[PDB]
Symmetry: C5
Subunit: 41 residues, 5 copies
Amino acid sequence: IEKQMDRVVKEMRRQLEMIDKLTTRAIEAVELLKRIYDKLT
Amino acid sequence: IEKQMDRVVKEMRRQLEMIDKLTTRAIEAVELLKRIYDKLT
Amino acid sequence: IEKQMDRVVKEMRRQLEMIDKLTTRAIEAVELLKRIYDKLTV
Amino acid sequence: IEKQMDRVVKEMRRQLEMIDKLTTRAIEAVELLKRIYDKLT
Amino acid sequence: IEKQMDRVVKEMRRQLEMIDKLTTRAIEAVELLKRIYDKLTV
C-alpha cells in the first residue's frame, strides 16, 4: 500500500507545482492590470 | 491503510489552499478590470 | 477501505467546489473584458 | 477495492470537466484581449 | 492494488495535461496584457 500511495503523492506534488506555476502567471496578469489602470488614470 | 490515506488527505488540503490563493488573484483581476471599465466609462 | 475512501471523496468534492468558485470569478472577468471591448468599439 | 477506486475515478472525471469549463473561460479571455488589442492598435 | 492504482495515476495525468493547457492559455493572456500595456505606453 505504501509504495502505491507514494505514486499518488508524487502525482499530487506534480499538480501542486503546476497550480503554483499557474498562480505565478495570474500574479503577473494582476500586476499588468495594475499598470494599465495606473496608466489610464 | 488509514495512515496512508492520511497522506493523501494532507496533500489534497494543501492543494485546496493553493486553489484559494489562485482564486484571490482572480478576485484581484476582477476588481482591477472593474476599475478599468469605470475609468473608461 | 470504504470508510477511508469516504474521506477522500469528501475532500475531492471540496476541490470541485473550489474550482467551481474559481470559474465563477473567471466568468466575471470575461464579462468585464466584454464590457471594456464594447466601450472601446463605440 | 475496484468498486471503491471507481469512486475516486468518477470524482477525478468530474474535476476534469470543471477544469475544461475553466479553460473555456481562459480561451474567452484571450479572445477578448486580442480584440481589445486590435481596437487599440 | 497496483492495477487499480494504475487507473488513478492515469486519471491524475489527464488532470496534469489539462492544467498545463490552462496554463498555456494564461500565458497567452499575460502576453496580450504586455502588448496592450506597451501600446498604451507608446
